[PDB]
Amino acid sequence: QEAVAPEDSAVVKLATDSFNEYIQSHDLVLAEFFAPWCGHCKNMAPEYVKAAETLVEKNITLAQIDCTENQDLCMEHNIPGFPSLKIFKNSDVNNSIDYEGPRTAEAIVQFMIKQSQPAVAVVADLPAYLANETFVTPVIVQSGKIDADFNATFYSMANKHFNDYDFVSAENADDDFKLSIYLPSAMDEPVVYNGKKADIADADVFEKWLQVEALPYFGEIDGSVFAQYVESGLPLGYLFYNDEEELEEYKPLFTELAKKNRGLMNFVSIDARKFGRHAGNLNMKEQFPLFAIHDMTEDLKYGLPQLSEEAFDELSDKIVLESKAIESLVKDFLKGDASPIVKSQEIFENQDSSVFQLVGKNHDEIVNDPKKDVLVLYYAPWCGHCKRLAPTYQELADTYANATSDVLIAKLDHTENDVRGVVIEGYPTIVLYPGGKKSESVVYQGSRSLDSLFDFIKENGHFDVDGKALYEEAQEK
Amino acid sequence: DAYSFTSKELKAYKQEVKELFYFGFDNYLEHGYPYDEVKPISCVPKKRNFEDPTDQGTNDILGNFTITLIDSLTTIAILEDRPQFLKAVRLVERTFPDGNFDIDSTIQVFEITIRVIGSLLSSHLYATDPTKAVYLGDDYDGSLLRLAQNMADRLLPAYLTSTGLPMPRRNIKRTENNVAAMASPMFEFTILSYLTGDPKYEKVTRYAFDKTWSLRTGLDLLPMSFHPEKLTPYTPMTGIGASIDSLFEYALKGAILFDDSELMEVWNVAYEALKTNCKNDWFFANVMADTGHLFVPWIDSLSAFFSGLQVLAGDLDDAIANHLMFLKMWNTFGGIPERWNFSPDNILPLEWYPLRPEFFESTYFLYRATKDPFYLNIGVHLLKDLKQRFKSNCGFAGFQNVITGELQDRMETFVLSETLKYLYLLFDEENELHNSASDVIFSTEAHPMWLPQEVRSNYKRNAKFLPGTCSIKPHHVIGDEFWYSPMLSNFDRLFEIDSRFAATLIKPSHMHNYNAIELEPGFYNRWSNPQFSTCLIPPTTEIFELLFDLPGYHQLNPLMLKTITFETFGGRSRLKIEKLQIYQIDYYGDLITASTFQDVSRKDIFSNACDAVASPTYLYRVVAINGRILPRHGSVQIKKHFKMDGIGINDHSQLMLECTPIINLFIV
Ligand SMILES: CC(=O)N[C@@H]1[C@@H](O)[C@H](O)[C@@H](CO)O[C@H]1O
Ligand SMILES: CC(=O)N[C@@H]1[C@@H](O)[C@H](O)[C@@H](CO)O[C@H]1O
Ligand SMILES: CC(=O)N[C@@H]1[C@@H](O)[C@H](O)[C@@H](CO)O[C@H]1O
Ligand SMILES: [Ca+2]
């Protein structure tokens, strides 16, 4: 598109001079500071226009400011970049909130509708309000008699989480205090708070309770709603499904798990068709359906065993995840006995060349061995310098392999393998792991020449194997 | 699942590219064979222009030896289809049963070397490598190697010149030459020497390469064209475009493959010269070799390979910045025009798009380096464009003129050899080339090359006739992101080119419907972070560059602390300074505040005249030095270990230009 809303559209074009007057003459106005050239605003324009059309019915105005024309206006508001969706309320030019949600007509409309309403809505009868309007975000209700300090902290949280949730206050003298959360997915089931009344008055306790219990039991995960699960801090259990039928097949078990494991970890459903590469990002192969548990706190991925690529290609029947297997994996992870999955290629069982191809699974095991001295080269297949080093590395590995069998020479593909506890600020990075029970790893800094590498291994090697003479002894023959 | 880029969808795209290549190849076999190429629109062979010798444009490429089949050999090998590769090898043997190219054709040494010899050598390596899925074994008998050796023997007499530099053209059966043509053949000929064990090819071509490099000027920039007998440069113009690209490409690639330190040093010096003089924010402009001043206002399409070359060299950020410009050019024209003016259709001097693979190559290498689905989307759109606009009755036809949209009636061999190959590899994540080999080096024509360790040792033994590093991640990549493309979301300057060159980026008539590749709604709605997918305010300040011809030697890799340290400042140093005026937008998109001018000393402690002048309106800021764009709040210090007028140093030790301090430039 052209990034500029059509004249016939509800959008209002605001110039430098006319901006202040329009802002002062209208209560709530969402202003977009865009630029016709860069395409973020171009993709913004259609959904923005649709949102403006929808909002005009509710009297909320949407405006467009072209920074290319109204330069001074744009600097005056300290615009960082385009598109910058800023909200002006109470005819206040100085005050300008920043829009944060997704750039979709539905998201913008919901955000503006929420901005129009007060932070906390006071309703005489809760059921009438609940039935009157459908909700797209969780509803937190402080029903019953409200303590002054709890009232203050509740309103403070509502101001803090204005965009995250919608807060409702239905005070009844007779009925006892009852804080609750209404998940849009299950409006019938409220998440009543069972803890003591004193601590919840604390801002931190209420924040934690919301961050934990304000998530759908088995909702559909996506980049937009990812921040909600990240903030909770619990481990996230993904379910990849190929089609809606598969999701309906797996929904009962995963809903039961999410309800049972509430407060420990979060379970979500991710559309494999839409997000298959996320499976790779989870250190799991793209073989769906697929259950993977991610621990964002420690950055440890745990998942069910997956068929090998050759077996997967031969396989012609749809993959099925056993419910017992899923439950066992969840239990093991919660207990902590489950072992993580490290980003790694298939173990190089067949080693034709002397250089021992290391994968993430066997890396730490191989280097940590005290019986041998290991010289791991960390390389990326695309980097030229590692390719340049490969011949010399092969010659050195051949020289050591037939000589004393005490120095192991290996390399690991860092792009395809993640090694934890090793600092790789670039490629190539040659790290010597000296033998012995306790021996700090040594990084190679010199020119990566054959003699230089031999001298490095001899000097910094525990076993002090002189490679260069061994190379010469082989050279004479 | 559109633009989701799962493994299954990538397999589907890979199959589509495979089918496209087979369509083109089978059409060539049915119609063009036994001639060099098949005209796609007219479905007739494109025979060598025997009648008109003067037509060197067509005769040079076409020697009438089924060049399309030979070039497609390597593409078939990469497809990992053993039956098809065996059939093609047998067809090549049948076309040349005697094992020699006894064809009366006056042909260009460089192009033939890169295409026929390169393809034959790579195909022989594939056939004789048991690991490769296209291994021939008993069926193969070294025929491809013998044919390559015969062609090399026929081409070598070109190097029997007074200076050892090859003649531009030669007749295999029996004046001006660009540096790329003079030097590049050495890569293929050295591979041939290793395989056969004959040193003569490597010696002669390597000597020619060394002479060509020695012809560079004091700035370490090489004029594109030269006269081998007189050794006089015809054009002071130089750059990374056509006629010089393969020289740098093969300098780096030969350094990598042959483990040659001299070649690596040559590459380092040449690349530093390019960054210092030619490099700009979004492309390597073409500058005069002697002075380093801009020569022409256009950048040719052949230079799109440099993003992949830089990915090989380890500079991800420069490669990304350079590749974005050609992405924008494709968005504007639907096809990268031969030449395009960045400073003002009439903008394009040469506007035909022969379907060159350089953009495809850069996209493939950048995807391999970054694994960013941004480049996967670029490849998907390129495939769609091929099918919808370039596909013809009997092949793929490029634009004869992007301004009008006319399609030329010609399928160049490099189309099948490189464009389809790179597209397939970009979509073939499981290909053996990058999954298993991990040491292959693509030639300039996209022919994989690798010297087996036994061959290397045999060649070294039987002769008879700090270091570099790679950047782990691009700068723009922030933390880890699973949901969104870092290029779309986190590259703030993604669309800066649209505004900066809006004058010269004019969509032709047929381009009106086409949307920007990165802005495809299906791709954008999936691979864009709403939190960070934000434009950047363009700089309203004045930006100018000055040249520092300080004596000494040039430091190839100045050390980075957010500071660049220059132990030596010898040679020309292109410094891109930014004028700072109150209440203006700087290079980094921030609003200049009065605090910037607070505590400013305009007095020269090394002189007296400037003191009276000092006794402000604007300041000076350095944003890029020698082509190295500084980061936000980026300082620069130069070790002392001046005469030039207008230069001064203050108490804070910041160099003054026009008695105006440079806030971030220091002289320690
Ligand atoms: C229903 C309606 O028109 N309401 C408008 C309101 O949108 C506007 O902000 C205000 C001040 O001009 O005047 C009211 O009459
Ligand atoms: C009982 C009740 O709702 N009291 C609220 C109080 O919590 C809030 O801080 C104040 C500001 O709007 O408004 C009062 O009506
Ligand atoms: C000059 C000419 O046309 N030569 C052709 C040659 O291109 C072709 O490969 C061969 C196979 O039949 O037949 C020759 O006559
Ligand atoms: Ca090329």
Author numbering:
A (entry chain B): 24 to 500
B (entry chain A): 23 to 196, 209 to 378, 396 to 516, 575 to 670, 673 to 726, 730 to 755, 770 to 796
Sentences from the study reporting this entry:
In Saccharomyces cerevisiae, the glycan of these proteins is trimmed by the luminal mannosidase Mnl1 (Htm1) to generate a degradation signal. Curiously, Mnl1 forms a permanent complex with protein disulfide isomerase (Pdi1), a redox enzyme found in all eukaryotic cells. Here, we show that the Mnl1–Pdi1 complex initiates ERAD-L by performing two crucial reactions on glycoprotein substrates, trimming the glycan and reducing disulfide bonds. Pdi1 contains four thioredoxin-like (Trx) domains (a, b, b′ and a′), with a and a′ containing redox-active CGHC motifs.
